[PDB]
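Example 178, ligand zinc ion.
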Amino acid sequence: NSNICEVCNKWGRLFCCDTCPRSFHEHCHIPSVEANKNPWSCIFCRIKTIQERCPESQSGHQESEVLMRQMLPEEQLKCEFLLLKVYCDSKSCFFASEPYYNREGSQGPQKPMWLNKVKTSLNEQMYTRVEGFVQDMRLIFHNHKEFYREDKFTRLGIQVQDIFEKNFRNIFAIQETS
Ligand SMILES: [Zn+2]
Ligand SMILES: [Zn+2]
Ligand SMILES: [Zn+2]
């Protein structure tokens, strides 16, 4: 197994996957690593299993159909994975905790949003459709772009949004287009 966390790339108290070589800090994995369960499979392995069990799930989909899906156990999982994939990029640190807004010439957003909040929302089953999740994720980056305006710092929002959007198209098998 790996001797660093797959999400944060640091050593420490790590839990190892039994079906692949990845390892996790307890609260880096999403969901948080389960108390018992021997063997234990990580979220990467659980996602691989869904694809394998139903190969047609990898055929192209329309975003509009994906968004309306109810948050049944498999959509719940895929949204947890997608979130995780954002936390895996180090630039996610800028969006993890609750922001504040005091900049000459800007006003804060009407509806602040941050990754840890989306994390808690998923954990508390507050989203009924994939749409709920995807809207709060996109809101993170949109709020950033709007606030930071022409400061080059806006680029961090573009960069982490690109990671989110690529992972979203991959995980939910969105139909490739030009
Ligand atoms: Zn970690
Ligand atoms: Zn695994
Ligand atoms: Zn099938």
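Summary: Helices lie at 43-53, 63-68, 73-87, 93-96, 115-123, 130-148, 154-171.
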